Curated annotation (Swiss-Prot), chain B:
NDH-1 shuttles electrons from NADH, via FMN and iron-sulfur (Fe-S) centers, to quinones in the respiratory chain. The immediate electron acceptor for the enzyme in this species is believed to be ubiquinone. Couples the redox reaction to proton translocation (for every two electrons transferred, four hydrogen ions are translocated across the cytoplasmic membrane), and thus conserves the redox energy in a proton gradient. The lineage of its organism: Bacteria, Pseudomonadati, Pseudomonadota, Alphaproteobacteria, Rhodobacterales. Belongs to the complex I 23 kDa subunit family. This is NADH-quinone oxidoreductase subunit I. It is found in: Cell inner membrane. It comes from the Bacteria. NDH-1 is composed of at least 14 different subunits, Nqo1 to Nqo14. The complex has a L-shaped structure, with the hydrophobic arm (subunits Nqo7, Nqo8, Nqo10 to Nqo14) embedded in the inner membrane and the hydrophilic peripheral arm (subunits Nqo1 to Nqo6, Nqo9) protruding into the bacterial cytoplasm. The hydrophilic domain contains all the redox centers. NADH-quinone oxidoreductase forms a supercomplex with ubiquinol-cytochrome c reductase complex (complex III or cytochrome b-c1 complex) and cytochrome c oxidase (complex IV), which stabilizes the NADH-quinone oxidoreductase complex. It comes from Paracoccus denitrificans (strain Pd 1222).
UniProtKB/Swiss-Prot annotation, chain C:
This is NADH-quinone oxidoreductase chain 10. The gene is nqo10. GO terms for cellular component: plasma membrane. Coiled coil: none annotated. NDH-1 is composed of at least 14 different subunits, Nqo1 to Nqo14. The complex has a L-shaped structure, with the hydrophobic arm (subunits Nqo7, Nqo8, Nqo10 to Nqo14) embedded in the inner membrane and the hydrophilic peripheral arm (subunits Nqo1 to Nqo6, Nqo9) protruding into the bacterial cytoplasm. The hydrophilic domain contains all the redox centers. It comes from Paracoccus denitrificans.
UniProtKB/Swiss-Prot annotation, chain D:
Belongs to the complex I subunit 4L family. This is NADH-quinone oxidoreductase subunit K. It is found in: Cell inner membrane. It is an enzyme of class 7 (translocase). GO terms for biological process: ATP synthesis coupled electron transport. The gene is nuoK. It comes from Paracoccus denitrificans (strain Pd 1222).
UniProtKB/Swiss-Prot annotation, chain E:
GO terms for biological process: aerobic respiration. This is NADH-quinone oxidoreductase subunit H. Belongs to the complex I subunit 1 family. Its EC number is 7.1.1.-.
Length: 121, 51, 195, 101, 342, 479
């Protein structure tokens, strides 16, 4: 397909080019700068005193519920992009069907808000 | 309500931006060290010397 | 070339998918998973399904990040040292072989062309084509999808919602209403006068 | 030359990989949720592959709805996992085992 | 040369040269962005800012860049070493990568794809993984805390980011970035640009852009006064340079999008001056100047307060706007002021 | 969507509208202070929607380019589902309040699950089948896990979600193969292409994947292992729901799929259904002997009974479908009666579920034990109970189709299964030393035991046209 070749192959080419530029910048210091590691240098930073522990412990995420609702809301908005692109050609059902779809969304959003699910645990 | 209206129109941010721009175009007191120096009074306590 | 593009995305997805399930590090599984979805999006573009290629990345970039949040929220206490695998690999190979044999002789029905509900038009861009059928011909499914998403909203809140009652909380609107003129005032304290 | 069989083979591999992840995992239920996502990704590869090679948009329409249910499934799957973690203190697969017989 | 430029090679060289043009512009602008950012804060702060390294300090960014190239790379003992180096790479690479679909003039675009808006969203959101993975892979507490804040930040500004621009797609009838610019062409210069019919979304997009770029008042993944350097605490030399480069490149992309979506891209504000890439660059640098001024005048939110803005302010407002715009466009209120499609 | 399309789906819109309005009413006007009121309005709504579906004049048709089928078969299934759902909610209302389990969202989640079931049985397209199935499945996972302080509720939801998602993935994979072969998702298009001379391995693989995915929802062996754990772990009101309404909807969906999409390859899928039915009947009967928890016993009872119902479908005839429909109707009535009694079981004010608690119950409450006796013999399939006539109908269909070997196996497994129903009767009437289980029943729960128990005998005299209604419904599907 021509559209693939003219428009999408440049994306693939530039993905490699931007990757090469980022990699060369990392390797620049890896090759030029002096490397002199010692146990104190490579230890974890906690403001001058040794860390109590590493960062591989459980940690309560007080916004966990909002993150679950983030997944749901992501899919709701996805249905709007083809609708917005097709807006000129929409039929009466196609137009008001979205309004019903968005009204059901707003009932869910009003339920979250009223329940208190948007306040952190 | 008056306070709620002003926050909706971002008045507190607009005032800050305007104040920032007034400082933006104003003279800078920065000294051009080492060409330009801070003021020293006769009483200034600096390096010791024997007279 | 199309051959090079296919195998780049095909090998990347299949290898990434394998690394998701056999690796021992759950955070590494998260990063393999996003590579699998990006590789599959590359395959979708090659076939001209660009909207679902881009939609897939948009959706699962956020969703995979949420998965990372739960991995670290419930991180096991044995991260440093994190079966019947032989028999399982045998059943997997058997199932994969059966599918390969079935796909060897794949041929659609000779009526498949005449039965297409939404034939593709070369002159119409993919996103416009989907929008012409998604909200009119499939309007019933469109509405049911909204209810499927609503059930997820209700369920998540019903199952998990709780709030600590022992921490300090502020009402943001009440914070913004605090009038400096009312909250601070000057006092004429006479000499020698205490509280 | 890349034809339909090429994409179906990729779909089959991802599908079997995702199924495999469910019944071999022992240590983490989140990785099972990832395997379910791999399994559904494999399905969408089939629907998109059949759609484009037939010249039909139904398979692409089907893919959008599979993503919708995948999102809803992940939300509910994580919510159910949250309540289990609170009740058990672990999310290891081998610990979802109190009921048996 | 005709026998050459038509071949696969002349086609392959054309893409590489086009790619170098984008890298040259974005990286060259990076020299003046870091300089200009610091000069603007200083001017608001009654001081000079960099003014000795080169004339008026104009070579300061070269000195900074070179200093990092000859600075030692320190690798934390407890860090996940592959993910540690992948995080800065993604941060810089993906921000630059998003510019492949940015048009600067009529026909001055490397990839003219139909879903350009969605591709921008895909690439910018994946860039956040550099911050999330950079913080977590360091395996120390301050970068770990910033890693969670980065995930919180994504949940805060992305939930309504799509809705904020859906109105512009409705008015345009396209996700092609060049199409959005052409929809803002008319006989009244800047009065045909989308900032006017979608004035509320300009504010909401600009604020969302600040959060997407980890910029004040939403500089929460660094937050010096709370987390020392946040996700970058354990990074040095060029790996650290890549995170800063990515931060400014992402900021520059938002400056491009603001100008493309709402201020007519390369179109002239006045009819009697010609359209061209100069107008695109002028608008991009005005919005960068707005980025710099905001850093100089605002304090920092708590990251739970950022989430309040996204879900309880921006989400209901953007959703309400989309419905309002759809009605106005559907019924061609004010003679298609919101219906720019043909 | 035309105005004729909208009229066809009006009962579904009415249910969906109620669920949305109920959600806002509960959120804004008291939350759990309305929980009791919302439960009873939902019961009325289920009955009102069933009246719309089942009463008046109906002319079979299709809506939305054939994606939604409104025929006598779908109307029979919807009515049983809605009435069974209404019964479960009504009989559980008092129990959930006493146990502090009645959230104002529980009635709404059940209503959206029933809405999904209504789209399942009227599916005329693969996408309609999927969206209806997934709306039901997602709602079922939630209520399985809704006892937040119970680790067993959490595990029941987790096992159901993971295995339900696996079955859904298999269903989708087969649905994708069927679409690729036929070029369409509509069943009228699919059936015309799937015929004797054109069955590649690919399309036969698709049928197997779809069948296995659906056979999970009726707990067919070996896609059954979720059922005992989920039945035990989930709240008893939620277990009673799983046992009655989803099984009816899922059984009708399988019949819809194999006749409206695979109706020209009956020979191919009849053998698979028969093999599922055999394994389910024997495992359910044999495994039930080893149960001491009454809720877990009902799961194996459920698996064995779905095996018998599949015998009618394995016949691949209009009579087989007619008798499968009657079987599911009688099975739902029996489970409503049984789970009404199980909910009432308690010692010292806490619910109890072990079988040993029934010892000598007949000498504690004579009328309740007599009702339980009729239900156990009805589940065992012993005359004169209406449960016997359910088995008689499916066995009639099997023999009528030249599958007497299946009927012989069916009756043999019935004998093994009869043991653990007889044992419950043994415990109640001449069991060992009693531990003081009491049956706490309000008026509604009490009628949920007696009326189904009476129906098992009164139904032996007259089925009141239900058998004739099932025959007309089966004809519209099979043709
Ligand atoms: C189609 C249109 C859809 C758009 C609207 C989406 C639906 C949102 C409704 C849900 C709101 C809700 O549950 O609260 C009702 C709110 C009561 O909420 P609550 O649970 O008591 O708590 C109060 C908030 O916590 C107290 O607020 P807060 O501290 O969380 O701060 C948020 C603040 C910020 O307020 C906002 O910014 C919200 C403004 C609403 C925007 C929607 C319309 C936009 C129109 C387009 C115009 C273009 C933009 C210019 O909003 C409020 O003060 C809440 C007012 C309720 C918003 C009503 C709309 O008032 C009602 O009872 C009204 C119900 C109807
Ligand atoms: C598209 C538009 C968006 C913005 C462009 C992108 C941003 C580019 C980055 C560079 C930012 C440069 C910041 C310059 C700030 C200079 C200071 C300022 O604002 O004026 C304040 C100063 C006044 O103080 P002084 O020097 O002490 O004056 C004493 C003396 N008797 C006098 O009057 O002086 O007065 C002066 O400094 C007077 C001289 C001003 C210098 C003018 C050139 C500035 C560069 C503009 C670049 C345009 C692109
Ligand atoms: C000020 C500097 C100039 C501002 C504009 C920057 C534009 C750079 C992006 C170039 C975009 C591009 O891909 O150009 C392609 C275009 C025609 O390519 P063609 O093959 O016909 O079409 C492609 C089909 N998809 O190609 C062209 O028509 C030519 C592209 C322009 C090349 C000149 C720009 C070189 C980069 C300058 C670097 C220095 C600027 C930075 C300094 C700081 C700025 C503040
Ligand atoms: C028939 C309508 C139900 C009325 C039930 C009467 C019971 C009285 C009662 O206490 O509850 C009514 C309840 C509103 O509760 P109320 O008690 O007024 O609240 C006090 C304020 N704290 O009311 C409710 O619970 C209302 C529940 C919602 C009913 C939805 C009605 C619309 C049906 C869908 C149609 C869709 C068509 C498209
Ligand atoms: C207010 C009204 C309440 C709802 C009643 C709905 C009535 C539906 C009905 O009668 O449907 C008729 C239908 C057959 O229709 P058709 O074949 O057209 O009949 C010839 C008509 N000229 O008939 C059918 O579809 C048959 C339906 C049989 C239902 C059997 C019961 C199902 C399981 C629920 C048991 C409930 C146990 C009791 C619980 C007590 C309290 C908890
Ligand atoms: C003490 C001794 C006990 C020994 C077992 C007793 C024999 C049990 C046989 C049951 C009756 C089965 C029968 O008569 O055959 C069923 C069927 C005949 O019906 P068909 O001709 O298909 O008519 C279709 C109607 N349109 O099909 C046939 O023609 C015959 C099918 C035979 C099915 C298997 C019978 C096995 C016998 C039971 C073994 C022990 C258990
Ligand atoms: C003079 C030095 C020029 C150096 C280069 C300037 C770069 C300009 C960036 C692009 C233009 C941005 C225009 C911003 C809008 C102006 C806001 C403003 O003047 O507010 C009123 C603002 C009121 O602030 P107030 O005094 O606190 O009320 O005006 C001023 O105080 C004077 C500032 C005028 C600035 C115009 C020149 C640009 C610098
Ligand atoms: C072997 C037992 C008896 C059966 C004899 C039949 C032999 C075929 C057995 C198939 C089992 C092996 C699995 C491979 C399936 C081959 C499908 C085939 O031949 O189709 C024709 C087909 C020919 O193409 P066509 O002419 O376009 O139909 O074969 C191919 O070339 C398909 C290529 C598959 C692509 C593999 C991608 C790998 C991704 C990276 C994974 C890591
Ligand atoms: C597409 C992917 C592009 C690359 C993504 C970055 C991730 C791959 C690099 C992981 C390197 C792990 C090396 C760890 C180690 O101990 O060696 C340090 C290694 C050894 O010190 P050297 O001998 O001075 O290089 O230090 C480095 O400078 C590593 C630089 C990594 C270069 C690739 C980025
Ligand atoms: C949200 C804020 C809404 C602000 C209301 C603006 C009213 C503009 C009505 C334009 C009516 C018209 O002729 O539309 C077709 C008209 C078509 O013009 P053409 O594209 O040049 O053919 O709409 C446009 O696209 C351009 C209209 C430009 C005139 C705007 C005048 C605003 C002045 C106040 C600025 C402050
Ligand atoms: C979402 C779930 C909640 C649903 C509750 C609201 C139901 C829909 C809104 C109420 C009014 C709808 C009246 C339809 C009028 C009609 O038939 O004529 C169309 C009418 C033209 O038909 P004509 O009269 O035959 O020319 O079109 C219009 O102008 C209105 C189009 C509205 C489209 C809305 C689609 C959503 C309804 C389907 C719900 C899905 C099932 C949920 C389970
Ligand atoms: Ca039929």
């Amino acid at each position: 397909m021509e559209y693939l070749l003219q428009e999408y192959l440049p994306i693939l080419v530039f993905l490699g080019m931007a990757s090469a530029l980022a990699i060369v910048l990392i390797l620049a210091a890896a090759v030029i700068a002096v490397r002199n590691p010692d146990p104190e240098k490579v230890s974890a930073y906690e403001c001058g005193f040794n860390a109590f522990d590493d960062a591989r412990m459980k940690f309560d995420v007080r916004f966990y519920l909002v993150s679950i609702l983030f997944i749901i809301f992501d899919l709701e908005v996805a249905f709007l992009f083809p609708w917005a692109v097709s807006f000129a050609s929409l039929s009466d059902v196609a137009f008001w069907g979205m309004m019903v779809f968005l009204a059901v969304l707003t009932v869910g959003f009003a339920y979250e808000w009223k329940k208190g699910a948007l306040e952190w645990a | 309500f008056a306070r709620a209206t002003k926050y909706f129109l971002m008045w507190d941010f607009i005032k800050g931006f305007g104040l920032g721009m007034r400082y933006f175009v104003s003279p800078k007191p920065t000294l051009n060290y080492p060409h330009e120096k801070g003021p020293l009074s006769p009483r200034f306590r600096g390096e010791h010397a024997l007279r | 070339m199309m051959t090079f593009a296919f195998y780049l995305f095909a090998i990347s997805a299949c290898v990434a998918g394998f690394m998701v399930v056999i690796g021992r590090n759950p955070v590494h599984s998260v990063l393999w998973l996003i590579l699998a979805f990006l590789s599959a999006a590359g395959l979708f573009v090659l076939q001209g399904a660009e909207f679902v290629a881009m939609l897939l990345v948009v959706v699962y970039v956020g969703a995979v990040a949420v998965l990372f949040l739960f991995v670290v929220m419930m991180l096991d206490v044995d991260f440093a040292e994190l079966r019947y695998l032989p028999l399982a690999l045998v059943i997997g190979v058997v199932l994969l072989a059966q599918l390969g044999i079935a796909f060897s002789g794949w041929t659609p029905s000779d009526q498949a062309e005449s039965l297409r509900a939404a034939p593709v038009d070369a002159a119409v861009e993919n996103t416009l084509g989907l929008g012409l059928v998604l909200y009119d011909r499939y309007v019933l499914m469109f509405q049911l999808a909204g209810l499927v998403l609503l059930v997820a909203m209700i369920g998540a809140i019903v199952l998990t919602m709780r709030h600590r009652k022992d921490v300090k909380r502020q009402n943001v609107l009440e914070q913004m209403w605090r009038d400096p003129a009312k909250t601070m005032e000057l006092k004429d304290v006479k000499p020698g006068q205490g509280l | 030359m890349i034809g339909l069989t090429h994409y179906l083979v990729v779909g089959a591999i991802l599908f079997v990989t995702g199924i495999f992840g469910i019944f071999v995992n022992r240590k983490n239920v989140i990785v099972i949720l990832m395997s379910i996502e791999l399994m559904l990704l494999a399905v969408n590869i089939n629907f998109v592959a059949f759609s484009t090679h037939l010249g039909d948009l139904a398979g692409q329409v089907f893919t959008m709805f599979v993503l919708t249910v995948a999102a809803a499934e992940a939300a509910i799957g994580l919510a159910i996992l949250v309540v289990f973690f609170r009740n058990r203190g672990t999310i290891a697969v081998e610990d979802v085992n109190v009921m048996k017989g | 040369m005709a026998e050459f430029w038509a071949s696969p090679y002349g086609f392959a060289l054309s893409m590489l040269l086009q790619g170098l043009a984008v890298i040259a512009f974005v990286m060259g602008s990076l020299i003046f962005m870091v300089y200009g950012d610091r000069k603007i804060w200083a001017a608001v702060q009654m001081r000079r800012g960099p003014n000795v390294v080169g004339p008026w300090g104009l070579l300061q960014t070269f000195a900074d860049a070179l200093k990092y190239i000859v600075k030692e790379i320190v690798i934390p003992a407890g860090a996940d070493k592959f993910v540690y180096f992948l995080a800065p790479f993604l941060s810089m690479m993906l921000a630059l990568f998003a510019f492949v679909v940015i048009p600067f003039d009529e026909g001055w675009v490397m990839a003219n794809i139909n879903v350009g808006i969605l591709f921008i969203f895909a690439a910018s959101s994946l860039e956040v993984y550099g911050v999330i993975m950079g913080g977590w892979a360091s395996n120390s507490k301050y970068p770990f805390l910033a890693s969670l804040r980065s995930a919180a930040q994504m949940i805060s500004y992305e939930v309504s980011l799509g809705l904020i621009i859906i109105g512009i797609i409705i008015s345009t009838g396209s996700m092609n970035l060049t199409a959005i610019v052409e929809a803002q062409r008319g006989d009244y210069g800047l009065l045909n640009w989308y900032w006017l019919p979608h004035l509320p979304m300009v504010v909401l997009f600009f604020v969302s852009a600040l959060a997407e770029c980890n910029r004040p008042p939403f500089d929460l993944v660094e937050a010096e006064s709370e987390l020392v350097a946040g996700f970058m605490t354990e990074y040095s030399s060029t790996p650290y340079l890549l995170f800063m480069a990515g931060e400014y490149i992402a900021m520059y992309l938002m400056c491009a999008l603001l100008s493309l979506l709402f201020f007519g891209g390369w179109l002239s504000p006045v009819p009697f001056i010609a359209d061209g890439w100069w107008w695109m660059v002028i608008k991009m640098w005005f919005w960068f100047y707005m980025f710099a001024m905001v850093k100089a005048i605002v304090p920092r939110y708590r990251y739970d307060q950022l989430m309040r803005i996204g879900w309880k302010v921006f989400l209901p407002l953007s959703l309400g706007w989309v419905v309002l715009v759809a009605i106005l466009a559907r019924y061609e209120i004010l003679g298609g002021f919101w219906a720019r499609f043909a | 969507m035309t105005s004729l399309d909208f009229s066809t789906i009006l009962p579904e819109v009415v249910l969906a509208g109620y669920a949305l309005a109920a959600l806002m009413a509960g959120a804004y006007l008291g939350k759990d202070r309305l929980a009791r009121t919302l439960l009873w309005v939902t019961v009325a709504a289920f009955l009102v929607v069933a009246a719309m579906v089942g009463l008046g004049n109906h002319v079979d048709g299709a809506a939305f380019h054939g994606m939604f089928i409104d025929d006598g078969f779908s109307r029979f299934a919807k009515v049983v589902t809605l009435v069974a759902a209404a019964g479960v909610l009504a009989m559980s209302a008092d129990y959930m309040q006493r146990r502090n389990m009645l959230r104002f969202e529980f009635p709404i989640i059940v209503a959206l699950a029933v809405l999904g079931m209504m789209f399942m049985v009227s599916a005329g397209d693969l996408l309609t089948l999927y969206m209806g199935l997934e709306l039901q499945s997602l709602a079922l996972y939630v209520v399985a896990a809704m006892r937040r302080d119970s680790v067993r509720s959490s595990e029941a939801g987790l096992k159901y979600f993971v295995l339900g998602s696996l079955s859904s993935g298999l269903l989708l994979y087969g649905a994708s193969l069927v679409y690729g072969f036929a070029g369409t998702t509509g069943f009228e298009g699919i059936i015309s292409t799937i015929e004797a001379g054109h069955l590649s391995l690919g399309v036969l693989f698709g049928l197997v994947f779809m069948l296995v995915g659906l056979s999970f929802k009726v707990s067919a062996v070996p896609f059954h292992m979720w059922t005992p754990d989920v039945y035990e772990g989930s709240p008893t009101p939620v277990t009673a729901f799983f046992a009655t309404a989803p099984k009816v909807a899922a059984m009708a969906l399988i019949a819809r799929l194999v006749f409206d999409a695979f109706g020209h390859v009956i020979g191919d899928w009849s053998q698979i259904v028969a093999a599922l039915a055999v394994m389910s009947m024997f495992l359910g009967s044999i495994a039930g002997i080893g149960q001491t928890n009454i809720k877990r016993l009902m799961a194996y009872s459920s698996i064995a009974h779905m095996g018998f119902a599949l015998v009618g479908l394995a016949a691949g005839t209009a009579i087989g479908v007619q008798n499968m429909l009657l079987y599911m109707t009688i099975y739902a009535v029996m489970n409503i009666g049984t789970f009404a009694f199980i909910l009432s079981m308690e010692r010292d004010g806490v619910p109890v579920t072990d079988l040993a608690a029934l010892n000598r119950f007949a000498w504690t409450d004579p009328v309740k034990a007599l009702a339980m006796l009729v239900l156990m013999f009805s589940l065992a399939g012993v005359p004169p109970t209406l449960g016997f006539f359910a088995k008689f109908g499916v066995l009639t269909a099997a023999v009528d189709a030249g599958m007497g070997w299946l009927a012989v196996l069916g009756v043999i497994a019935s004998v093994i299964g009869a043991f653990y129903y007889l044992r419950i009767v043994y415990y109640m009437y001449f069991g060992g030393e009693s531990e003081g289980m009491t049956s706490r029943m309000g008026a509604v729960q009490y009628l949920a035991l007696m009326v189904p128990a009476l129906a098992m005998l009164v139904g032996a005299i007259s089925m009141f046209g239900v058998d004739s209604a099932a025959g007309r419904a089966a004809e519209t599907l099979v043709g």
